[PDB]
Amino acid sequence: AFAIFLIVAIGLCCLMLVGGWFLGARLRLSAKFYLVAMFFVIFDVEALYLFAWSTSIRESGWVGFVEAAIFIFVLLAGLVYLVRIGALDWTP
Amino acid sequence: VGWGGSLQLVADMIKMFFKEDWIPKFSDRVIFTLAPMIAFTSLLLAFAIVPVSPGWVVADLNIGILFFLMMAGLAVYAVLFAGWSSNNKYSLLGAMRASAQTLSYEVFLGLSLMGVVAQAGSFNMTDIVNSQAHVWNVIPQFFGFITFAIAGVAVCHRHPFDQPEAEQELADGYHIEYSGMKFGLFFVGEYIGIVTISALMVTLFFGGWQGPLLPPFIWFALKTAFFMMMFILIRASLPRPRYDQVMSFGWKICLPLTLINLLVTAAVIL
Amino acid sequence: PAWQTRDHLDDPVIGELRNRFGPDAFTVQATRTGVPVVWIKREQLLEVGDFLKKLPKPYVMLFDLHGMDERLRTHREGLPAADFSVFYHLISIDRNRDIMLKVALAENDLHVPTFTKLFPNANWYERETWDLFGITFDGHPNLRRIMMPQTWKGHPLRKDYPARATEFSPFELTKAKQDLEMEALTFKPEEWGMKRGTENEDFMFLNLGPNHPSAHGAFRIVLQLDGEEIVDCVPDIGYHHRGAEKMGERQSWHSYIPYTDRIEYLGGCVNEMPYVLAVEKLAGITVPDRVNVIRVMLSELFRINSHLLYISTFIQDVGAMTPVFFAFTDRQKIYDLVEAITGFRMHPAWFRIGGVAHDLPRGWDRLLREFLDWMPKRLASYEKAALQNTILKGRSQGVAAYGAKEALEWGTTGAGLRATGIDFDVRKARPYSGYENFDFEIPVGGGVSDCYTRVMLKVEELRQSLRILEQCLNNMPEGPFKADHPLTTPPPKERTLQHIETLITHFLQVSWGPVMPANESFQMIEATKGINSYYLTSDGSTMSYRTRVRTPSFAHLQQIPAAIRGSLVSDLIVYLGSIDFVMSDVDR
Amino acid sequence: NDMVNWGRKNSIWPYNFGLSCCYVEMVTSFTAVHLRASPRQADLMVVAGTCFTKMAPVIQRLYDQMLEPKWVISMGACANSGGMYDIYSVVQGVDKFIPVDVYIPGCPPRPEAYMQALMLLQESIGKEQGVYRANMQSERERKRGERIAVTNLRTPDEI
Ligand code: SF4
């Protein structure tokens, strides 16, 4: 089953690590601009609704496609907003 | 001379064993040890969802896709605890930019996979592998297939080519402060990653277990081998893309492509 | 003849200086340098230089500044009484003329006012004069050791200093422990130049020593950073010092020839040409025409190889390297021709005083004809691939540009100086090695010097070199490969094997060395990078008394801090790739 | 079993320390045999070029950085000894301060010489710096009867 395979994998990890042991302040302008990753943190939450959506669409039908188009159109409007304001651009 | 291509990886794994380990001074110890297995065990247990056989299935669980996405998200922590455990602003910023492009390019795989799981309509992999009985789910979704390809090769598979070097000065690749077995752990991890992406591609996009005139498990194995060779051919053909161009062709180009892909499949399925 | 010892007193510059200063102070030497050498006491140096700088046709470029020991010269007829000397070679481009100024110094008062104020490129030269000799230049901004480490006691170009490592203690690691302690305690005292900015959060000190590929050797360029801006860049050079100048003093005229090949690894016979030409100028040898055409063939082949490497590396670093790696295969074919003629792929060591080592083998014409017919189609494929590209072309416009005055003050020659509007090659202004019997053009960049203009000029020069090489294939004359003169070293070998007097000449020439009479020669050529020259002084013995090698790469690496001030680190790396500098040439 | 020996013979990781000159032939070799080589990961360091007195501590730190199994190849006359530069500013060989295993004479050596260096180093790595009582045999002595039996060579007036 899955539990046996998980036990095998963790046993292999223990075997390799045990065998290996026996064998023997100020950044200024640097970094910053992770806001692409903040865009991912928000966009994964947006796409989790599509993750739940993808299971049941045949019984959803026409209003489902309509309001899914509205949803992704709102996301596209936000994306072009971020592009045109200069948030989504070249980043260090 | 060695006649097999795989024997080189075998010799590499043997070589990484029995190498003296030095302690790093002014470094954290728990993450220095834990960062390799976040990259290794994740794609090792990503192998637990392949339908290699109906009778020898490794795990007959109802959902495998969400586990794959959970490993995709987990993978970033390996590059991040490696960056912090480097304890050198050069390597830390190198792993920060590598994790940047990683989180940037990991977005696409879930939304690209929504198309195939929507035309399949189930999460149990037996239903998907039985769905591709006469018509494979690759003819309509060309864009989804190439988007999933780009996403799968973009998760620390060296196609971005910013892992062992850095286009930007004042920083350095984060594979320098690891020199023991952990470097072999990275290589074996990306190896199981590429073979698992190929296996998932064949069993989720193309038709696994068909058996036109020969037993279907070797049919799956040979198709996986052909896609392995094609992946290596295009990985080698793929030149190094600088950081900028990768940022340009990220969120701009493939988020709309997968959104109109979901629109097209939802419009044609009913 | 073109080798006889002349005074050049009739030259107009000598009469203008005689009118302005009247009599006295000036002693006009007799030499075979081709230029007027004048001695001018150190108290009048700055006045003379200032007058020459503003003269109605000025000497805009200080070609060279260095020192001579002069203590052991027994033949000193006409020179003033000197224990040390410092020579300054200046060039007027609008006159296409040169002037050499020599200031004599005594052993107790080795002091002269610094010349950097007029010409900034002299600064490192004066620093070098402080390092290799013991002359102190009062008024120098940062007078520290630029070649040897900072704890090295002794001035290696003095004749009281033993030259060879054998006379010192071997690497016993007595100093390795102290250098280890020094490297572990890596701190900045702010003595590396002006370093006006303080060491705090406002300014960050970064060694920025590129050990990656295309760096053309490992070196450090200490950089002061503020807002990711280049506040001040100070190169730390001298890691690759090979002591070529000191080595020239302990080798015969014949056995030094191998050392010339390693001033530039890509030059080969180009590096040998000025040395043999200077030695034959000391000997008073006029060579036959076949020697000239053979030398032109080998020099244009090596120049083509170096230019192809520069083009390939330029397209690889800032562009797509997939197609241009085929040029590596083409370079391999050029090598099979060099080792077909000379014998060995790199460092041929094939030129000799008075000629070459052997005759051409009988199958040279078919191979050269095959290379000349095959090459033009590939060259035009690269011309379209490089002139018409847009991405790097758009990137490589206006990137750290400079003008004619800026190039002139920094001694920069070669594609840098030709990228501006000054039409000045030495192969046309001062023909050498029989270039005056050939028809070729000098491409020019117009008025803006940048990286695109430099590479386009290098492609145009490669096309002119291919025209020269076909003219060499179609007009190669007949006759000897060695001059007929008792100082031609060695004699023809078949004559040596049969004739007693030729055997005796060969015996004493290869054993004790040829005796060159005491005089001074000087030759400059267009090298693969810039203008490379050789100033040789003989004291009448079988070894050189002083060998000075002027390499342009020293000036090209000195030039980076004036132009890159106000740019990013990426622009710095792109400029370092663009500039034609090799560490072996900078450190000789 | 000697499986570890097979592991070490089959695979080695090269650290390229070629200097200003002498590295163009090494590149010629590397672009035919092979961005994989990385600092603090390799066990083989091919010292080439003129080892200068000023930068020798850099070579000593890079020697210290590598792992327990350390191999060193000296290439060129400038690295085996001082070479032609017997001068105050050049140390007379890299073997003065670090142990060396294989010496490859030449100035510069050939890419095939680099290939033969890998062959002699896998041959040395396959007999367990250990002589194993097999390295007293020398290339001066091994191919001696091969080289002495050569009588005629092509005349140098031909291509
Ligand atoms: S061996 Fe020859 S090519 Fe190599 S560094 Fe020494 S002189 Fe240069």
PDB file of N, CA and C in Angstrom, chain C residues 67 87 89 93 166 316 322-323 358 366-367 378 381 455 480 514 523 547 586:
ATOM      1  N   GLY C  67      62.459  54.098 -17.773  1.00  0.00           N
ATOM      2  CA  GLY C  67      63.803  54.438 -17.348  1.00  0.00           C
ATOM      3  C   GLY C  67      64.876  53.493 -17.844  1.00  0.00           C
ATOM      4  N   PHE C  87      63.546  58.163 -20.177  1.00  0.00           N
ATOM      5  CA  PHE C  87      63.200  58.533 -21.541  1.00  0.00           C
ATOM      6  C   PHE C  87      61.689  58.640 -21.717  1.00  0.00           C
ATOM      7  N   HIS C  89      59.084  59.033 -24.950  1.00  0.00           N
ATOM      8  CA  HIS C  89      58.822  58.985 -26.383  1.00  0.00           C
ATOM      9  C   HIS C  89      57.459  59.608 -26.662  1.00  0.00           C
ATOM     10  N   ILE C  93      50.853  63.141 -34.411  1.00  0.00           N
ATOM     11  CA  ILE C  93      50.094  62.436 -35.436  1.00  0.00           C
ATOM     12  C   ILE C  93      49.944  63.301 -36.679  1.00  0.00           C
ATOM     13  N   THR C 166      67.312  31.371  -8.542  1.00  0.00           N
ATOM     14  CA  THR C 166      68.240  30.464  -7.871  1.00  0.00           C
ATOM     15  C   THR C 166      69.060  31.177  -6.803  1.00  0.00           C
ATOM     16  N   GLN C 316      30.002  35.792 -28.731  1.00  0.00           N
ATOM     17  CA  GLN C 316      29.644  34.806 -27.714  1.00  0.00           C
ATOM     18  C   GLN C 316      29.247  35.453 -26.391  1.00  0.00           C
ATOM     19  N   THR C 322      25.792  30.014 -30.773  1.00  0.00           N
ATOM     20  CA  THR C 322      25.585  28.768 -31.509  1.00  0.00           C
ATOM     21  C   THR C 322      26.247  28.784 -32.882  1.00  0.00           C
ATOM     22  N   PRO C 323      26.026  29.783 -33.749  1.00  0.00           N
ATOM     23  CA  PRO C 323      26.654  29.703 -35.079  1.00  0.00           C
ATOM     24  C   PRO C 323      28.145  29.989 -35.081  1.00  0.00           C
ATOM     25  N   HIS C 358      63.697  28.246 -42.049  1.00  0.00           N
ATOM     26  CA  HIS C 358      63.790  27.361 -43.201  1.00  0.00           C
ATOM     27  C   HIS C 358      63.118  28.034 -44.388  1.00  0.00           C
ATOM     28  N   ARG C 366      49.407  25.457 -52.864  1.00  0.00           N
ATOM     29  CA  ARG C 366      48.095  24.829 -53.008  1.00  0.00           C
ATOM     30  C   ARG C 366      47.264  24.973 -51.737  1.00  0.00           C
ATOM     31  N   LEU C 367      47.898  24.854 -50.569  1.00  0.00           N
ATOM     32  CA  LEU C 367      47.159  25.007 -49.319  1.00  0.00           C
ATOM     33  C   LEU C 367      46.680  26.439 -49.131  1.00  0.00           C
ATOM     34  N   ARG C 378      32.507  32.153 -46.189  1.00  0.00           N
ATOM     35  CA  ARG C 378      32.294  32.142 -44.745  1.00  0.00           C
ATOM     36  C   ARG C 378      32.444  33.542 -44.164  1.00  0.00           C
ATOM     37  N   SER C 381      29.350  35.324 -44.673  1.00  0.00           N
ATOM     38  CA  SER C 381      28.300  34.845 -43.778  1.00  0.00           C
ATOM     39  C   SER C 381      28.440  35.460 -42.389  1.00  0.00           C
ATOM     40  N   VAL C 455      34.066  46.371 -33.775  1.00  0.00           N
ATOM     41  CA  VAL C 455      33.969  45.052 -34.402  1.00  0.00           C
ATOM     42  C   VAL C 455      33.795  45.173 -35.914  1.00  0.00           C
ATOM     43  N   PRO C 480      66.512  34.026 -52.076  1.00  0.00           N
ATOM     44  CA  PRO C 480      66.874  33.421 -50.792  1.00  0.00           C
ATOM     45  C   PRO C 480      65.876  33.749 -49.693  1.00  0.00           C
ATOM     46  N   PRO C 514      76.194  36.788 -31.544  1.00  0.00           N
ATOM     47  CA  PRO C 514      76.704  37.796 -32.481  1.00  0.00           C
ATOM     48  C   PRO C 514      77.068  39.088 -31.768  1.00  0.00           C
ATOM     49  N   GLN C 523      61.819  50.039 -33.148  1.00  0.00           N
ATOM     50  CA  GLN C 523      60.800  49.760 -34.156  1.00  0.00           C
ATOM     51  C   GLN C 523      59.432  49.605 -33.507  1.00  0.00           C
ATOM     52  N   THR C 547      66.316  46.322 -23.007  1.00  0.00           N
ATOM     53  CA  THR C 547      65.218  45.957 -23.893  1.00  0.00           C
ATOM     54  C   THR C 547      63.936  46.510 -23.292  1.00  0.00           C
ATOM     55  N   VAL C 586      49.716  43.000 -20.642  1.00  0.00           N
ATOM     56  CA  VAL C 586      49.744  44.071 -19.653  1.00  0.00           C
ATOM     57  C   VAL C 586      50.928  43.895 -18.713  1.00  0.00           C
TER      58      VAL C 586
END
